[PDB]
Amino acid sequence: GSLRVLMLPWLAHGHISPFLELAKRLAKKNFHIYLCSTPINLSSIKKTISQEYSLSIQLVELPLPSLPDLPPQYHTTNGLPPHLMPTLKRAYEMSSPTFSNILKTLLPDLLIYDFNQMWAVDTATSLNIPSVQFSTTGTITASFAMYMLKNYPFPEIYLWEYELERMRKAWVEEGDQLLECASKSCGIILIKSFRELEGKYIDFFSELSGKKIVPVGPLVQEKGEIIQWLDKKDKSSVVFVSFGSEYFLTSEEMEEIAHGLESGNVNFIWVLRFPVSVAEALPKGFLERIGDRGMVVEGWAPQAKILKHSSTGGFVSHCGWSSIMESMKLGIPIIAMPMQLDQPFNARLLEEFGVAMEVVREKDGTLRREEIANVIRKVVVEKSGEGVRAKARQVSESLRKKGDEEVDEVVVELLQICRKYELIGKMS
Numbered sequence: 190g191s192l193r194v195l196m197l198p199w200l201a202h203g204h205i206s207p208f209l210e211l212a213k214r215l216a217k218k219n220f221h222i223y224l225c226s227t228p229i230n231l232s233s234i235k236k237t238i239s240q241e242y243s244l245s246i247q248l249v250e251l252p253l254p255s256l257p258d259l260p261p262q263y264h265t266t267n268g269l270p271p272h273l274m275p276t277l278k279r280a281y282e283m284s285s286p287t288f289s290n291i292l293k294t295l296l297p298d299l300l301i302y303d304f305n306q307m308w309a310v311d312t313a314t315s316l317n318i319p320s321v322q323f324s325t326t327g328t329i330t331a332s333f334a335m336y337m338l339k340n341y342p343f344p345e346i347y348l349w350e351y352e353l354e355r356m357r358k359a360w361v362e363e364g365d366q367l368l369e370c371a372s373k374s375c376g377i378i379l380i381k382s383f384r385e386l387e388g389k390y391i392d393f394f395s396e397l398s399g400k401k402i403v404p405v406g407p408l409v410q411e412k413g414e415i416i417q418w419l420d421k422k423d424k425s426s427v428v429f430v431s432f433g434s435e436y437f438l439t440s441e442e443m444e445e446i447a448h449g450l451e452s453g454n455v456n457f458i459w460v461l462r463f464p465v466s467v468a469e470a471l472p473k474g475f476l477e478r479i480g481d482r483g484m485v486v487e488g489w490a491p492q493a494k495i496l497k498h499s500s501t502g503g504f505v506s507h508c509g510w511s512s513i514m515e516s517m518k519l520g521i522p523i524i525a526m527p528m529q530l531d532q533p534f535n536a537r538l539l540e541e542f543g544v545a546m547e548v549v550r551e552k553d554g555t556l557r558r559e560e561i562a563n564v565i566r567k568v569v570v571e572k573s574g575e576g577v578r579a580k581a582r583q584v585s586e587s588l589r590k591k592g593d594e595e596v597d598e599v600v601v602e603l604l605q606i607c608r609k610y611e612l613i614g615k616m617s
C-alpha cells in the first residue's frame with residue numbers, strides 16, 4: 190500500500206522541520222510526499238534534504254499575495270517583525286486559490302495539514318481528498334488547549350505562580366478555528382510523541398477531541414571549531430545552552446545566565462541570539478576569566494552534532510518540543526528553563542518523566558545565578574543528578590531500539606482512511 194500525500198506545514202521553521210521528518214519516514218515506506226510551503230521556506234530546508242529523497246519528496250511552492258509591507262522574503266515567521274503577524278496570517282489565507290490549483294494539478298490521495306489551515310481542508314474536501322491533522326507539539330499541549338477551548342486530571346501538570354500571568358494574557362487575548370481544524374481531521378490526528386512519554390495524555394486528548402490520536406514517534410533528524418573544542422574536553426562534562434529559534438533573552442536574563450555559568454564552573458557552549466556585540470552583552474571580564482572553559486556562539490550552532498558528542502553532559506533548554514525530543518534521543522539530561530508558550534508544560538512533563546531538573550525562578554519570576562549554577566552542577570556533576578543522567582541514558586537506548594514502529598501504525602491508519610474515503614466517493 191502506498192499513498193501520494195500533500196503536506197502543508199504552518200509557515201515556521203519549527204513546523205516545517207517536523208513535517209519534513211515525518212515526510213522522510215513515510216518516504217521510506219514507499220509513500221510519495223509533496224511538501225508544500227512558501228518559496229522562502231522551501232529554499233532553506235531544500236539544502237538539508239539528502240539526495241536519498243530525490244524520488245520520494247518533492248517540494249511544491251505556495252506563493253502568497255505580496256504587499257509592500259509583506260514581500261515574499263517575509264512569507265514566513267522566521268525573522269518576521271511581530272507587528273506583521275496578522276498580515277502574514279491574512280496573506281496565507283488568501284493563497285487559498287493558489288492552493289486549490291495545486292490540489293487540482295497534483296490530485297493527491299491525502300492532505301496532511303497543521304493547526305490552522307481551515308481553507309486548505311475545505312479545498313481538499315471539495316475535491317474529495319481526505320485531510321488529517323498533524324500536531325507538531327505534544328499531547329500535553331494539545332489536550333490543555335482542548336480543555337481551554339471545549340469547556341484537568343493530572344496533578345503533576347501544574348503552573349508555578351509566576352507563570353500564570355503569561356498564560357492568562359495569551360488565552361485572554363481564533364479558538365473556534367483551532368477547534369474546527371481539529372474537528373475536521375478525518376478519523377485520526379497524528380502527533381509528534383510516543384506512548385512511553387505521554388500515553389495517558391494521548392488517551393485524554395483522544396477522549397476530548399473524539400479522534401483516535403496516533404503518535405508518530407520523536408521524529409528526530411570536516412570538523413568545525415565548536416566540535417574541535419568539544420574533542421578536547423572530558424566525557425559528559427560540557428553543558429550546551431540554547432533557548433530555541435524564536436525566543437530572545439531579556440537583558441536581565443542574559444546577565445544572570447552568564448553569572449550562573451561562571452558560578453557553576455562546568456564547561457559550556459552557549460548560543461547567544463540577538464534581534465536584528467558579544468563582549469558588550471556579557472559582564473566585564475567574563476570571556477577573559479572563562480578562557481578555554483567555555484565558548485559563546487552568536488546566532489546558530491550545530492545542535493544535533495553537539496548533543497551527539499561524547500563530551501556533552503547536559504542541555505540548558507527552553508524546552509521547545511523538537512529540542513527535548515532530540516535531547517532524549519541522544520541521551521542528554523535537561524536543565525529545564527521554560528520561557529513561554531507550551532514550555533512550562535513540557536518542563537513539568539520532563540521532570541515527571543525523570544530526564545530533566547528545572548531551574549525554578551523566584552516568586553517575582555526572575556532568575557538567580559545561584560539557582561542556575563546549582564541545577565547545572567547537580568545534573569552534570571553531582572550525585573544528586575545520577576537518576577536524571579541514568580534515565581536519559583535509558584530513554585536514548587529504547588528510542589534507538591524502537592526505530593520506526595510508530596510509523597508502521599501511521600501508514601496502516603492512513604491507508605484505511607483513504608480506502609474508506611474513496612469507496613464513499615465512488616458513490617457520487
Ligand SMILES: O=c1ccn([C@@H]2O[C@H](COP(=O)(O)OP(=O)(O)O)[C@@H](O)[C@H]2O)c(=O)[nH]1
Pocket residue numbers: 203206431432433434435436460488489490491492493508509510511512513515
Ligand atoms: O542554535 C540552534 C538553535 C536551534 N536549533 C534547532 O532548532 C530547533 C528548535 O526547535 P524547538 O521546538 O526545540 O524550539 P522552537 O524553535 O519551536 O522554540 C531544534 O531542531 C534545534 O536542533 C539548532 O539546530 N541550532
